[PDB]
């Protein structure tokens, strides 16, 4: 056994012992030490509450930092040049009597800049325009007039846009982080006897579900289990494209790829989740495929028409939109319920001895009520299409716009090609520059526009007292384009995230969120995106003449209103 | 209501007449009698030597008379391949 | 000739079954069966191979099946009446 001294936030040196080969997360929870909030996600790299600062001579001889850990450390308050995550650090012989250490870290609320606009004028604008496609441009103009912080006269609500503020906001992250509740979606769950899933839960029910989901949806261990399956879909996508490309005289195919990409994510998702191969890649869309995609579009659309109203108003002003909203959900829940009645029946008659997808595990483990697996299985089947495919288009688009960056991501991919063809798991590690390109697309084009938190205690950001119970919103669009942190912000430059990683700059890459409510599909999205683009770069050149900027629409998520005409020229 | 095909080889034993009559009798007896048997027999034969057929919906199926008697429910069936 | 259709039906099903992780395919088979009988019938009768087994339904296939359903349906509405009444 080994002795390890922990310096707490209050300044006191706690001493305990652990066995060699133990994670210092094990050392902390198996001795009930009083480090509040330490180890929230029980060792699945889905939080940064095991953050610990090490002595120079111990830190130097520790294992190299993985991208999975470094991305987590980037969302850790009080980051240091000597900090690591306790969950990833197993005790070793040379750490006897090691000393680790955990980090520590005004005008009234009403003196903050106010949004000129009026709740009701805007409410009625939406009543007729049936949407507010331009909202992201309104808020950018606001921040560029009022400063990096303002409130909206409504209840209290403040909109921020800096890493400084996101770092503080995570310090306040409770044991039960509270995102605000979307009543239009929950109304649907209440009306049909359905359980809300993680996206729409708060309090203990949230924490209960999440801790039984992270293991098989987000863990690096689960990511290694389904990464080979995504590889098969992305391979089949490029070989499908190449066949048709090579039939044309000039070894090229230019097209609008938005449809083919959306059908890729449906396939990679449905396979990773339900182990089923739908046969949508390479072949024509199906009726169920296009009905599912439409219902999603209608659901997002009808959400912005009901989100800003209480149900007391939208009841009688836009009852039709309620009918429209539910029939969307009706089609969605029909698609998802059938993938699960498919697998529940299968598994009932034989439990397999190998990996058969994410939900298969959850069902086998049976740590959740089936009505609670059904609800999360829905959230995952429906969240894994639009949010994954729009970032994936805009990446292709920016590579066609930036030939320089393309040829460098290509070299990287060809270089690592054989290494990945033998063992797909290596894409995590062998493609660092491509992963920096996904941060660059989601910086400029963040399909998740806002992070929201109802705070659980008086805090303060940018010197304006923020009382408890207040909504805070992180406008990622204006965040990504602040030239002060992102030199020449509209320039597409993936190498910038490698520059950033050396220095201890924090919270710069936050489109999936932070804390334990950060996106559960975060590493599934990254898997689907990374390999498709990897397999496309080692076979095709991507070009385009439409290099104007693409106008982007707000329909609950931030998406392009233009889909560009891209060329895929085969290399031989 | 018990599904037991052997009963038709035991009915063949103790000679009992007119027990299997869904195609009719006489010379107005169904002209497609042996084409139907052919289509049905071989499909199921070829399915049994490759697949296992299972289902959770083992409630009875409600049947509707719409000239012919047919099921109003179509059950969700699993085809698991055998490999040995 | 029927053997060929039933063989092509199982080998079609097996291909798709074997693409799934668990070596299984659960579904509502009523459509695929109906298209089997159209194929086995049309081949035994006219010697023609319509290519409905293993591939997607055709417009003519689904229009034919619907017309059958409507015909049976509309028959029970007129069978018990003399045409003096149903007129
Ligand atoms: C680029 C792709 C994606 C982006 C940018 C994104 C963004 C986000 C954001 C910002 C949140 C809220 C974070 C917070 O409140 O702290 C979130 C939550 C969530 N996302 Fe995504 N997401 C993406 C893909 C996905 C995928 C593919 C899935 C499912 C397969 C998914 C399912 C979820 C779920 C279930 C939650 C709820 C997490 C919770 O409340 O604990 N997302 N996502
Ligand atoms: C399980 C399948 C079938 C059943 C249970 C069935 C049943 C019957 C029955 C009960 C009759 C009347 C018997 C009688 O009046 O004595 C009949 C007649 C007839 N069936 Fe079917 N049938 C089947 C399949 C078929 C098929 C596949 C065809 C055509 C390929 C067909 C064509 C006919 C014809 C043409 C008659 C008229 C026979 C006559 O009036 O002499 N049937 N069928
Ligand atoms: N049910 C459900 C459900 C369907 C789609 C989503 C998608 C779209 C809503 C915004 C977002 C953030 N991360 C994922 N998503 C989230 C939940
Ligand atoms: S507990 Fe170590 S990262 Fe979540």
UniProtKB/Swiss-Prot annotation, chain B:
This is Cytochrome P450 11B2, mitochondrial. The gene is CYP11B2. It comes from Homo sapiens. Transmembrane segments: none annotated. It comes from the Eukaryota. It is linked to Corticosterone methyloxidase 1 deficiency: Autosomal recessive disorder of aldosterone biosynthesis. There are two biochemically different forms of selective aldosterone deficiency be termed corticosterone methyloxidase (CMO) deficiency type 1 and type 2. In CMO-1 deficiency, aldosterone is undetectable in plasma, while its immediate precursor, 18-hydroxycorticosterone, is low or normal. Expressed sporadically in the zona glomerulosa (zG) of the adrenal cortex (conventional zonation), as well as in aldosterone-producing cell clusters (APCCs) composed of morphological zG cells in contact with the capsule (variegated zonation). The chain holds residues 421 to 503 of 503 of the full protein. Induction: Expression is induced by angiotensin II, potassium (K+), and also by cAMP. Expressed in aldosterone-secreting tumors and in adrenal glands of patients with idiopathic hyperaldosteronism. It is found in: Mitochondrion inner membrane. A cytochrome P450 monooxygenase that catalyzes the biosynthesis of aldosterone, the main mineralocorticoid in the human body responsible for salt and water homeostasis, thus involved in blood pressure regulation, arterial hypertension, and the development of heart failure. Heme binds at residue 30. Belongs to the cytochrome P450 family.
UniProtKB/Swiss-Prot annotation, chain C:
Induction: Expression is induced by angiotensin II, potassium (K+), and also by cAMP. Expressed sporadically in the zona glomerulosa (zG) of the adrenal cortex (conventional zonation), as well as in aldosterone-producing cell clusters (APCCs) composed of morphological zG cells in contact with the capsule (variegated zonation). It comes from the Eukaryota. It is found in: Mitochondrion inner membrane. Changing residue 22 to W: In CMO-2 deficiency; reduces 18-hydroxylase and abolishes 18-oxidase activities; leaves 11 beta-hydroxylase activity intact. It is linked to Corticosterone methyloxidase 1 deficiency: Autosomal recessive disorder of aldosterone biosynthesis. There are two biochemically different forms of selective aldosterone deficiency be termed corticosterone methyloxidase (CMO) deficiency type 1 and type 2. In CMO-1 deficiency, aldosterone is undetectable in plasma, while its immediate precursor, 18-hydroxycorticosterone, is low or normal. Corticosterone methyloxidase 2 deficiency: Autosomal recessive disorder of aldosterone biosynthesis. In CMO-2 deficiency, aldosterone can be low or normal, but at the expense of increased secretion of 18-hydroxycorticosterone. Consequently, patients have a greatly increased ratio of 18-hydroxycorticosterone to aldosterone and a low ratio of corticosterone to 18-hydroxycorticosterone in serum. A cytochrome P450 monooxygenase that catalyzes the biosynthesis of aldosterone, the main mineralocorticoid in the human body responsible for salt and water homeostasis, thus involved in blood pressure regulation, arterial hypertension, and the development of heart failure. Expressed in aldosterone-secreting tumors and in adrenal glands of patients with idiopathic hyperaldosteronism. Belongs to the cytochrome P450 family. This is Cytochrome P450 11B2, mitochondrial. The chain holds residues 160 to 246 of 503 of the full protein.
């Amino acid at each position: 056994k080994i002795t390890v001294h922990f310096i707490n936030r209050d300044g006191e040196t706690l001493t305990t012992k652990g066995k060699v080969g133990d994670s210092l997360l094990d050392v902390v929870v198996e001795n009930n030490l009083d480090i509040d909030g330490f180890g929230a996600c029980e060792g699945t790299l889905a939080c940064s509450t095991c953050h610990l600062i090490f002595e120079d001579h111990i830190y130097e001889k520790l294992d190299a930092i993985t991208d999975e850990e470094n991305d987590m450390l980037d969302l850790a308050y009080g980051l240091t040049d000597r900090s690591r995550l306790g969950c990833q650090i197993c005790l070793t012989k040379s750490m006897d009597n090691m000393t680790v250490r955990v980090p520590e870290t005004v005008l009234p609320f009403e003196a903050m800049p106010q949004h000129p606009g009026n709740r009701w004028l805007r409410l009625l604008q939406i009543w007729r325009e049936q949407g507010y496609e331009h909202l992201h441009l309104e808020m950018h103009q606001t921040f560029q007039e009022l400063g990096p912080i303002f409130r909206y006269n409504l209840p209290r609500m403040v909109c921020v846009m800096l890493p400084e503020d996101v770092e503080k906001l995570q310090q306040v992250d409770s044991l039960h982080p509270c995102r605000m509740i979307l009543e239009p979606w929950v109304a649907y769950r209440q009306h049909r006897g359905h359980k809300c899933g993680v996206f729409l839960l708060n309090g203990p029910e949230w924490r209960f579900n999440r801790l039984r989901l992270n293991p098989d949806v987000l863990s690096p261990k689960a990511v290694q289990r389904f990464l080979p399956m995504v590889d098969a879909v992305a391979r089949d996508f490029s070989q499908a494209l190449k066949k048709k490309v090579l039939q044309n005289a000039r070894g090229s195919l230019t097209l609008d790829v938005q449809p083919s990409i959306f059908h890729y994510t449906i396939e990679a998702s449905n396979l990773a989740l339900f182990g089923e191969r739908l046969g949508l890649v390479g072949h024509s869309p199906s009726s169920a495929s296009l009905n599912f995609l439409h219902a999603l579009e209608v659901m997002f659309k009808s959400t912005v028409q009901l989100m800003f109203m209480p149900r007391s108003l939208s009841r009688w002003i836009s009852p039709k939109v309620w009918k429209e909203h539910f029939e969307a959900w009706d089609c969605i829940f029909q698609y998802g319920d059938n993938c699960i009645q498919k697998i529940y029946q299968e598994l009932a008659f034989n439990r397999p001895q190998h990996y058969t997808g994410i939900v298969a595990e959850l069902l086998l483990k049976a740590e959740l009520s089936l009505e609670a697996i059904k609800a999360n299985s829905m959230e995952l089947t429906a969240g894994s299409v639009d949010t994954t495919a729009f970032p994936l288009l805009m990446t292709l688009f920016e590579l066609a716009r930036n030939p320089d960056v393309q040829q460098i991501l290509r070299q990287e991919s060809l270089a690592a090609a054989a290494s990945i063809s033998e063992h797909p798991q290596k894409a995590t590690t062998e493609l660092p520059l491509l992963r920096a390109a996904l941060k660059e697309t989601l910086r400029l084009y963040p399909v998740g526009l806002f992070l929201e938190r109802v705070v659980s205690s008086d805090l303060v950001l940018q010197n304006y007292h923020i009382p408890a119970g207040t909504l805070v919103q992180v406008f990622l669009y204006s965040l990504g384009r602040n030239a002060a942190l992102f030199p020449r912000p509209e320039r597409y430059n993936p190498q910038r995230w490698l520059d950033i990683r050396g220095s201890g700059r924090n919270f710069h890459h936050v489109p999936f969120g932070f804390g334990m409510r950060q996106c559960l599909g975060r590493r599934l999205a990254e898997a689907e995106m990374l390999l498709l683009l990897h397999h496309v770069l080692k076979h095709f050149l991507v070009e385009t003449l439409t290099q104007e900027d693409i106008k982007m629409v707000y329909s609950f998520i931030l998406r392009p209103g233009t889909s560009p005409l891209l060329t895929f020229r085969a290399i031989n | 209501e018990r599904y037991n095909p052997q009963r038709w080889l035991d009915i063949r034993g103790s000679g009992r007449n007119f027990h299997h009559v869904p195609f009719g009798f006489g010379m107005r007896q169904c002209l497609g009698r042996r084409l139907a048997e052919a289509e049905m027999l071989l499909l199921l034969h070829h399915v049994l030597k490759h697949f296992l057929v299972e289902t959770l919906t083992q409630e009875d199926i409600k049947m509707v008379y719409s000239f012919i008697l047919r099921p109003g429910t179509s059950p969700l069936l699993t085809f698991r391949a055998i490999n040995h």
